[PDB]
Design a binder for this molecule. Structure first.
Ligand code: EHY
Ligand code: EHY
Lengths: 123, 122
């Protein structure tokens, strides 16, 4: 029965995305084939089961560069990364396959389930 | 156009608080009176105009310890910090004055406005 601020959670994510847009206190580079994506570790492990298992390990917690698998589509990771910071996922008929594969790799089980619904609703 | 996850922002904030509870990637110690509070700077800058101005400054951006004005109540600040990581304010008759004052200091305009509404209602 504490007083709840209905917008506070999304206003924090918005400001966090702004800090990423200005490159303020970002602490890791994600390398996907050729492309590089800078982000905050905390946001990364709060959304992805793979980044969680990487940074939860005290041995890997201080890494500033993560090389994803060479098979991982860079544009798919870019879509999922922007989803982490905005709650808005951009599924298209031309990217659904790459986005879903990337989601399973990053272990984002809710995004994977949504990708299936999108697939089922397009067959 | 894009698919909106209505519970996503809230689930992210919940997982951030879990990281704070286990002290994973906490990167600053906020000291009030003599009590230490461990937090993530990004969460602090996103919720507080004070912590925004502090950590935007390249002189203080990477400091490990920030000491607040000793006029600030610790229990009150603990309530604002908890609200930062949860969206829930433990606003009570016996702490609203301390919570509002601490909110003004941290430059948290929305929490101040909500405090004044409850005072004006009484
Ligand atoms: S921070 C955090 N906490 C969840 C705690 C948990 C860890 C593992 C299993 C259940 C809960 N990240 C996370 C972890 C995993 C997936 N997606 C995000
Ligand atoms: S990240 C951020 N504001 C995003 C950019 C902004 C800077 C200044 C004013 C509005 C927005 N933190 C903040 C700053 C000030 C108050 N409360 C939180």
């Amino acid at each position: 029965s504490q007083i709840q601020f209905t917008r506070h959670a999304s206003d924090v994510l918005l400001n966090l995305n702004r800090l990423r847009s200005r490159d303020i206190l970002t602490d890791v580079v994600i390398v996907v084939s050729r492309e590089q994506f800078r982000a905050h570790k905390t946001v990364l492990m709060a959304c992805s089961g793979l980044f969680y298992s990487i940074f939860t390990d005290q041995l890997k917690r201080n890494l500033s560069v993560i090389n994803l698998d060479p098979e991982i589509n860079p544009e798919g990771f870019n879509i999922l990364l922007d989803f982490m910071y905005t709650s808005r996922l951009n599924l298209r008929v031309g990217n659904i396959m790459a986005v879903m594969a990337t989601a399973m790799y990053l272990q984002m089980e809710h995004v994977v389930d949504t990708c299936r619904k999108f697939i089922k609703a397009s067959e």
